[PDB]
From a paper:
Here we report the crystal structure of [name], which reveals a fold similar to that of NAP family proteins, with minor differences as compared to [name] and SET/TAF-1β. Interestingly, we find that binding affinity to histone H2A-H2B is significantly higher for [name] than for [name].
Based on this prediction and further alignment with the sequences of [name] and HsSET/TAF-1β for which crystal structures are known, we decided to truncate the first 13 residues from the N-terminus and 35 residues from the C-terminus of [name]. However, we were able to solve the structure of [name] NT/CT to a resolution of 3.42 Å in the space group H32 by molecular replacement (MR) method. The domain I consist of long antiparallel α-helices of the two monomers arranged in a “tram-track” fashion, which is the characteristic feature of all the NAP family proteins. The dome-shaped structure of [name] shows an uneven distribution of charge, where the concave face is more acidic in comparison to the convex face of the dimer. [name] forms a tetramer assembly with its nearest neighbor.
Author numbering:
A (entry chain A): 22 to 155, 181 to 186, 198 to 221
B (entry chain B): 20 to 142, 147 to 156, 180 to 185, 199 to 221
């Protein structure tokens, strides 16, 4: 009468979803191995960064999007930051954290400030950050954007934005 | 400046290393794609079987899709009414390119049974010429091919049920 072959096609689509999930799992395994491979070279690059004074402030101010978020007083405060680290979860799908380490600096009583993102299986995310012991109010909503851009755009190659 | 340099250059070296590493990683990812495209070849083919039973399936999918709904003119809809099946094939590798093949039934408009539009990645778009008798102007804008490949292809039911 009425073709339920649409339901048979729904079955085929759900079947292909399993192959897609397995391929995603293998891609995640590749990225898991390579983040472990990349941890030493990033840890060594931060040593080079420490030699360059206010490297991260220059990189951020040179970046257009985050450079809009300068908040010049918060920019003078961000000049103080000792280093910047971005850690991915052991299982790369769960989440990640971004940690700004500040050597002893006024305007902030906390040495290190980090924002952690945990990914729920539905798709929504939970963003929780270290409390401030006081612009740069990103540690307290809009989207992953900031926590996103630094991870994708600035963290791998900050040098592209440094010399501009 | 005298010293501030060497440091920078060292970092450049470090950055280059990352690139190399990333390249290696990327390679493996691509391989997985290859590995699973073969795995997907039967189902997709098998999927086409079901599609042959549904009347005016791919036309309804093109129309229901918000992006490709407005691309089809009335003449293009009438031409789509005839098509038998649709196929999309990645290359033997994955970074080389892909082709989109419209297998159309005998039509009064055009004699050609199947039309293949192939994009190749040089690190090149070529179409089988129609034999006559706005979207169909396909045989710079490859998007019309990317949105078909990435969104509609894998799951046309994403915007279906109309």
């Amino acid at each position: 009468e009425l073709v339920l072959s649409i339901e048979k096609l729904q079955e085929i689509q759900d079947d292909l979803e399993k192959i897609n999930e397995k391929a995603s799992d293998e891609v995640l395994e590749v990225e898991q191995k390579y983040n472990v491979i990349r941890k030493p070279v990033y840890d060594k690059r931060n040593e080079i960064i420490k030699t360059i004074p206010d490297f991260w402030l220059t990189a951020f101010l040179s970046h257009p999007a985050l450079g809009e978020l300068l908040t010049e007083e918060d920019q003078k405060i961000f000049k103080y930051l000792s280093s910047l680290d971005v850690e991915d979860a052991k299982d790369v799908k769960s989440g990640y954290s971004i940690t700004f380490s500040f050597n002893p600096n006024p305007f902030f009583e906390d040495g290190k400030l980090t924002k952690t993102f945990t990914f729920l299986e539905e798709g929504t995310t939970k963003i929780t950050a270290t409390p401030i012991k006081w612009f740069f109010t990103w540690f307290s909503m809009q989207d992953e954007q900031v926590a996103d851009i630094i991870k994708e755009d600035l963290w791998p190659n900050p040098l592209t934005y440094f010399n501009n």
